[PDB]
With several copies, the nearest count.
Chain A
């Protein structure tokens, strides 16, 4: 069921939590899986999205799960487990390879890539493995930082992106660059340096094999999430390498492995849409999905100035890219207070929507 109401979920009274009212969702990056062991409601009915809403360092407390049950949202646990050596605003990529099972608990591997530094204020390419394992009533964690020793074909460290992949050992895509200041650089860092490259990243063998294509150089700061079920993956706008030309987008760009039974024939195309107004990106993030279409937020809850168009604002854009007659409509826009920082919650063949914000800790629902 798409086009469902707001559901401003229930806030935290800070009665058994820390002194933040759980408002520390600013600068956060995480993942979530519909998964078993209902350790937050032992009922024969409530299927539960298991989740760890904090996976960061200098953004917040170190890591933290959440009480995303079947329907409602509350608190169920407070961690500071593996207390903050971690990364800045980086990424939170696709789950790692599964491990041999145990009688009572299940295994998880999280990859973290890219980001700033809370100490040097420069680039970082912290490839990070984190082992996560869930038994009932508690969990554990292990940290596996891997610097450039195990890294083969090291990509340039850079600012910001998301990462998508087939669930084992395959391509992980399209970081976003920094005009980094170095020694003798501090004047006029408004230049434009570029790579704009494919790179297939095997998850176990740490090797960024760059896939062959004549490279479309621009537009690498935001993107969408890869879709299953006659698969596709789309990049969305937000950058012109300079911070001076806007990214008023009227088209999309499909990066997709063409014949997915093997991993071959990497091509590129663009498709113009039934454009509602203009300017797909409000220079911010949407990246979320649906089951036969996209769910793309991102607009200005507060109208920071678009450079050339006076277009962008907080509403939802939904793209019918799965249709060969690729058009753009809207769902009924639940104009809550939300905007400008959303994170996804998808499900296949059905619409089940969750989301976070900066400090308006709420739920985006459709």
Chain B
């Protein structure tokens, strides 16, 4: 008759049904008298079960993100309000989840409850990015809230290095670059350009991350027997504007373009391949103990750096998904430059009229067969149309003088052929000859720009394509890819963040409401829930491919 509360809790989340609506449906089928879903007092018992902070290591949830006094304005507290977790409990509660997966994951060997025997080598990733223009409330105070929010989350990818000579991957979380495998850590209302605050909220999380990393742990008193793990991370969701203003460097660059190598702006040459690692801190001190702007000024700098270098592990950083936007802003720009017979990238007073008019003509012509409404701030759906295997002739159809047309399609064709390296979730398990030839293939692709075009602008992502990808995937003890290591799982999460706040969560008080954003957003992404909900068997129709016909319909 009556039911299981975990079934109801799994039922609620895929609806994104707010709590009062579930109470209303419970009351309706109660008043009609149907043996049905559980009451919410049966829910909020086990709602505190899945909250973090219920394990041990190698009691109030939802801690305030200020953690100092109120009545004494001696510290200049910056304008920020939000809720965070302790990071280690957030690691451990996710570790409680995949325990049963490891049980069916320790196959072809077994020997499962052997604690000092088989130590599991897991590896994950994290990152943070800001927001823009979320609504502001009454706030009853004497200082505003600057419109924006910070979020910090982290995923889980692999769990096998330290295994046998038959070192075999046993769990990959098959999506993996998405929502519903992103566990939240930090939500706060703040701002990051006149920043002041990342050292208040995000700073101590990284100072905890240093104590986390590179250590054998045990999920202490898990469930009956324990289970050990070796935690490893990979910080690469820190896309370029975040990269340098807290990785010490300077954003637009104009002297050193990469946050991995040392390279001149004006080099379209073969390679750099240098891998600066944490040296810059020492070159802070030489600027700090001697003549801040007048010592070693553009003299010893492998790369310019103002501050003393927040978040730590700088030998690993690139994104994949957040390069298609700059690749599109590169190639559509090149097509516009080709459209009117101009040269020398600029907006000169007798050239930019031709440039803007040809760009408007390209916009209307691309509208007459495809879609481009906006002009600025390209979207990834507009990116993927510009690299699909079809529609290549439609992107060049106004370009006369067909030799330039053939070369312009040929460079894009090289780009399609060699684009499959990144935004592939697992290379080294596919396309491995392309993986072992991609450096020479990308040198050829830059060579095609080198001879058919005298322009050669090298923006901040071409140097992250024609180098820093072959050796990056090739590198030992990393992961061996960039695609599954990307940063789209936060961004669709940001699509949820307005959606879980703008008329979803507690309203009427800012700090009391953002906590209820974070609580249900933590409950949204437990795999223990999504394995228990929405898991049925659809009616089979012989793999939905063919009777013997009709690849479509």
Contact = CB atoms under 8 A, between A and B. Distances in A.
B207 A183 contact: yes
Nearest to B69: A243
Nearest to A27: B76
B315 to A, nearest CB: 21
Interface in A133-192: 143-147, 149, 159-160, 181, 183-184, 186-187, 189-190
A119 B307 contact: yes
A4 to B, nearest CB: 22
A209 interface: no
DSSP majority for the A interface?
loop
Contacts of A304: 71, 73
A105 to B, nearest CB: 20
Given A159-B74, A304-B73, A121 B68 contact: no
Nearest to A246: B71
B308 interface: yes
The CB with the most chain A CB atoms within 10 A, among B72, B76, B307, is that of B72
A232 to B, nearest CB: 26
A85 interface: yes
Interface stretch (B94-102, B196-204, B319-327, B545-553): B196-204
A190 B68 CA distance: 7
B68 A189 contact: yes
B122 interface: no
A280 to B, nearest CB: 16
Contacts of A259: none
Given A145-B288, A221-B74, A302-B368, A120 B203 contact: yes
Contact of A284 (B69, B73, B196, B306): B73
Contacts of A13: 353
A160 B73 contact: no
A284 B75 CA distance: 11
Interface in B56-85: 67-69, 71-76
Contact of A243 (B71, B204, B291, B308): B71
Contacts of B68: 189-190, 243
Q: Interface residue tally of chain A, by bracket?
A: 35 or more
Contacts of B74: 159-160, 221, 238-239, 243, 283
B204 A305 contact: no
A307 interface: yes
Q: Interface residue tally of chain B, by bracket?
A: 20 to 34
B292 A85 contact: yes
B291 A143 contact: yes
Nearest to B203: A121
Contact of A85 (B199, B203, B293, B357): B293
Interface in B30-75: 67-69, 71-75
Contacts of B307: 118-119
Given A186-B67, A189-B68, A284-B73, A145 B292 contact: yes
8 contacts: A13-B353, A118-B199, A118-B307, A146-B289, A147-B288, A239-B74, A284-B73, A306-B71
Interface of A: 11, 13, 27, 58, 82, 85, 89, 116-121, 143-147, 149, 159-160, 181, 183-184, 186-187, 189-190, 221, 238-239, 243-244, 283-284, 302, 304-307
Given A145-B288, A189-B67, A190-B68, 20 more contacts: A13-B353, A118-B196, A118-B307, A119-B307, A120-B310, A143-B293, A144-B291, A146-B289, A159-B74, A159-B75, A160-B74, A184-B211, A187-B67, A221-B74, A238-B74, A243-B68, A243-B69, A283-B71, A304-B71, A304-B73
